[PDB]
Design a protein around this ligand. Structure first.
Ligand SMILES: OC[C@H]1O[C@H](O)[C@@H](O)[C@@H](O)[C@@H]1O
Ligand SMILES: OC[C@H]1O[C@H](O)[C@@H](O)[C@@H](O)[C@@H]1O
Ligand SMILES: OC[C@H]1O[C@H](O)[C@@H](O)[C@@H](O)[C@@H]1O
Ligand SMILES: OC[C@H]1O[C@H](O)[C@@H](O)[C@@H](O)[C@@H]1O
Ligand SMILES: OC[C@H]1O[C@H](O)[C@@H](O)[C@@H](O)[C@@H]1O
Ligand SMILES: OC[C@H]1O[C@H](O)[C@@H](O)[C@@H](O)[C@@H]1O
Ligand SMILES: OC[C@H]1O[C@H](O)[C@@H](O)[C@@H](O)[C@@H]1O
Ligand SMILES: OC[C@H]1O[C@H](O)[C@@H](O)[C@@H](O)[C@@H]1O
Ligand SMILES: OC[C@H]1O[C@H](O)[C@@H](O)[C@@H](O)[C@@H]1O
Ligand SMILES: [Ca+2]
Ligand SMILES: [Ca+2]
Ligand SMILES: [Ca+2]
Ligand SMILES: [Ca+2]
Ligand SMILES: [Ca+2]
Ligand SMILES: [Ca+2]
Lengths: 142, 142, 142
């Protein structure tokens, strides 16, 4: 049994290692981030991620934020994050409805507020509330 | 133990998710389809797939058929499938020798019959019996 | 439980199979080799591999040697291997400090010895002791 489990863990390490080495994904602790390289709107990203068995990425620690930023930098595009203020403005929540804890707003944001329901990450890793219809790099977490 | 198994299942989900997201493979239920993008004959495809620990793909449900068709469409080439009528014509079997159940013949096929031992999938997902020496997209199942 | 373990092993086979089929990695027995395609010096390769959860590759059997050689051939570059003679010349050890067993020196090597601390693999799979500051294909094992 333990030899079976050793084998299994080893093979998982190998597959993860190859995907990491080749830049196919980025792991931060127990979270994996990845992109298909496409730039599409918020609803399309959500669909793309859930179809792959994941979720549109959202950073909950500085180290997670920096990993997503590095992907934004690599593709030179902003990234939509997994949070919205669709109910009442300024009140951002994760897509499961929980209130946001970690934030990294660009100085002065969130503002501009007509309806800026979504959040985009600039390539320096800071955040801007934005409408949800822009074409942004699809980044998923697993 | 259960935490160990939770960890293992999570990591498998992550690696599968990254491969899916990036278009490296397509999963239909418990079956995974993938291509190396090469176009080669039937015997070479078989070798290529078994070397990777899989088998030349064969659809057994409409949903499996559509996944392989989508790969054929993406690469704009026909796909050899894992079935033959090498013994007596019109009598198609899977490579393990079992009689074929699900079929999706293009209207009028199978015909043309000299020796058309193999089966190719057109890019609309329908099938044609064909000789085995053509260059066709290598699609494997795992 | 056994169905759970069957599922897990199957999915691992699928992910390994896709990575193999697509040329992302090469498996020899229980060892996986892979490259990010970059050419950098010895210290950088070590870092690159350990960051991915692996180690700079070193062949310990003829079959492992041939797999790394095939990657060197594919990228038309020499490969730094995971061994050094930094202590006293001619005395090569793996990075964990164990004495080297399997070798495949090009005829006449190791020689040229000023300080040739590292080992590079030529594209025919044979070895040359070399300084560690050259740009060589990064090949990792997992
Ligand atoms: O702007 C449209 C956009 O606004 C809403 O707040 C959200 O539910 C999004 O899912 C939707 O796509
Ligand atoms: O699991 C759902 C959860 O997944 C990710 O973390 C993000 O998309 C969140 O906004 C969402 O609440
Ligand atoms: O420059 C800040 C301001 O710029 C634009 O108007 C929009 O992208 C806003 O979301 C943002 O707040
Ligand atoms: O045409 C040659 C072809 O014909 C036979 O029926 C099959 O066994 C194939 O494996 C073989 O490659
Ligand atoms: O496992 C063997 C089996 O694998 C795949 O489904 C196909 O190649 C079949 O034709 C073959 O019988
Ligand atoms: O067009 C139908 C007919 O076309 C060609 O002759 C061949 O590809 C046959 O296998 C096929 O049946
Ligand atoms: O030439 C520099 C080189 O020489 C030493 O022997 C080794 O420890 C290497 O790690 C180092 O990079
Ligand atoms: O696990 C450490 C071990 O990993 C690989 O096999 C090589 O880099 C060796 O030189 C090293 O001793
Ligand atoms: O040709 C053999 C000789 O060539 C060069 O001088 C260097 O690469 C040496 O490491 C090697 O031994
Ligand atoms: Ca707002
Ligand atoms: Ca704003
Ligand atoms: Ca026929
Ligand atoms: Ca025909
Ligand atoms: Ca030497
Ligand atoms: Ca030398």
């Amino acid at each position: 049994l333990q030899t079976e489990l050793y084998e299994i863990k080893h093979q998982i390490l190998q597959t993860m290692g190859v995907l990491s080495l080749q830049g196919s994904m980025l792991s931060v602790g127990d979270k994996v981030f990845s992109t298909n390289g496409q730039s599409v709107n918020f609803d399309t990203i959500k669909e793309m991620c859930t179809r792959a068995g994941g979720n549109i990425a959202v950073p909950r620690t500085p180290e997670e934020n920096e990993a997503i930023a590095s992907i934004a930098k690599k593709y030179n595009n902003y990234v939509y994050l997994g949070m919205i203020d669709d109910q009442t403005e300024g009140d951002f929540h994760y897509l499961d409805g929980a209130s946001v804890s970690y934030t990294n707003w660009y100085p002065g944001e969130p503002r501009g507020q007509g309806k800026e329901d979504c959040v985009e990450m600039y390539t320096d890793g800071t955040w801007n509330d934005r409408g949800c219809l822009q074409y942004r790099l699809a980044v998923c977490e697993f």
